[PDB]
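Hi all, posting the design record for the shared folder.

TITLE: backbone redesign
STEP: 1 of 1
STRUCTURE INPUT:
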């Protein structure tokens, strides 16, 4: 083959909190009482929106996220394996350029991963 297995991948990540969390707070400290059942609808909805061309992940992360990712664009840059959560890297390195994962749980809140490169 021409290219080998990606040693590094550039992926962006979204975060949404819910009732069952260590600290259901956002970056701007909003009230998060919404349960996983509700957050699931948000996740699925956002996933659909991004693929429907309604909204972009970067624009999404900068708004509809309970993490600091909103002020960090959401992009983590090109990172190598063996540095973050196993399920996180397993998903990101399994994604393609322009591909996005589903509801990935690596923390208390739900994360979405988008491989930009």
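Okay, here is what came back for every position:
SEQUENCE:
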């Amino acid at each position: 083959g021409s290219h080998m297995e990606p040693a590094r991948v550039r992926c962006s990540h979204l975060l949404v909190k819910h009732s069952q969390s260590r600290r259901p707070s956002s970056w701007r400290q909003e009230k998060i009482t919404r349960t996983k059942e509700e957050a699931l609808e948000l996740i699925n909805g956002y996933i659909q929106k991004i693929k429907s061309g309604e909204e972009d992940f970067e624009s999404l992360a900068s708004q509809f996220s309970d993490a600091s990712s909103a002020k960090a664009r959401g992009d983590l840059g090109a990172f190598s394996r063996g540095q973050m959560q196993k399920p996180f890297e397993d998903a990101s390195f399994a994604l393609r350029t322009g591909e996005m994962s589903g509801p990935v749980f690596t923390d208390s809140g739900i994360h979405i991963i988008l491989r930009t490169e």
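COMMENT: The beta strands are 8-16, 75-80, 104-105, 110-115.
Let me know if anyone wants the other runs.
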